[PDB]
Structure formats: C-alpha cells, structure tokens
UniProtKB/TrEMBL annotation:
It comes from Arachis hypogaea (Peanut). One of its GO terms (molecular function) is abscisic acid binding. PROSITE patterns: PATHOGENESIS_BETVI (PS00451). This is Ara h 8 allergen. The keyword Electron transport does not apply. One of its GO terms (cellular component) is cytoplasm. It comes from the Eukaryota. Belongs to the BetVI family. One of its GO terms (biological process) is defense response.
Length: 156
C-alpha cells in the first residue's frame, strides 16, 4: 500500500531562491546537518534518475543511504527524491518518497507543500515511528536549505 502525508510549510524566502538552493542541496546539507557527512553521486548527472549515496551517522554508527532523484520541475518549484536503498530504508518500506512544492506567498515569501509517501509491499503497514522520522527529515532538509539562504543573502 501507499501511505502519504502532506503538510503545509511557510518561509520568508521567495520560491525561486529556495528552489535554486534546493538544487545545490548536495553541497549545502553536509555543512548544516551534523549527521549528514557527505553526499556522493553514484550514477547520473544530477537530474531525474540520478542515484546518490549519503554518508550519515546515527548514534555514533556510520550508515549509507541511497537516494534517487525523481523530478526537478522549475514550473512547480519542485524537488522530489526517493529513498531506494541502504539502512535508512526501513524493513517495512519498499520506497520512501519526499516531495517539495512551492508557490509564491502573499508577502514575498513562500508557501510550501511537503509530502512524504511511504510504499509498502501489499498489506504490510508502515512502522509508525517511520512516519515521524520521515516527516522530521523532510522538514529538516527544507529548514536547512532555508537557513542557508537566509544566512547567505547574496548567494541566491
């Protein structure tokens, strides 16, 4: 089955800036997110279908997570990717997709939608702690990218 949660988020940063910075997430995130050590391209040019390998530390334990880029759409200010492999993928999960979509806000900022989609095989239910952790990671990445833009106003 597929279990989805969609949450609304806001930022004072306008969406083109946020989108541009999301495209540089591979170099922004390891600096900001202490548990993300590095991001390496396994295959591809950075667009849809690119597989990336993230080196993480969780509780003193080094782990590898594989992400597949799903879509990068300027028109929706969208940056979507999937967890496709590694320990970050729970035993119950076939795939976890993270989607971000932005629109212009009323005050020159952004209104965002963050979507977490958790695919399971057949009637298997997801681990509920996984929804929580997935929600927080999606929001954590968005806040990282936002934080970097706010702290570096001439970069974007």
């Amino acid at each position: 089955g597929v279990f989805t949660f969609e949450d609304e988020i806001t930022s004072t940063v306008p969406p083109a800036k946020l989108y541009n910075a999301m495209k540089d997430a591979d170099s922004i995130t390891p600096k900001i997110i202490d548990d993300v050590k590095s991001v390496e391209i396994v295959e591809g040019n950075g667009g849809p279908g690119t597989i990336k390998k993230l080196t993480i530390v969780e509780d003193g334990e080094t782990k590898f997570i594989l992400h597949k880029v799903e879509s990068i759409d300027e028109a929706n200010y969208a940056y979507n990717y999937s967890v496709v492999g590694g320990v970050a993928l729970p035993p119950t999960a076939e795939k976890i997709t993270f989607e971000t979509k932005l629109v212009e806000g009323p005050n020159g900022g952004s209104i965002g939608k963050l979507t977490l989609k958790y695919h399971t095989k057949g009637d298997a239910k997801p681990d509920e702690e996984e929804l929580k952790k997935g929600k927080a990671k999606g929001e954590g990445l968005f806040r990282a990218i936002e934080g970097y833009v706010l702290a570096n106003p001439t970069q974007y």
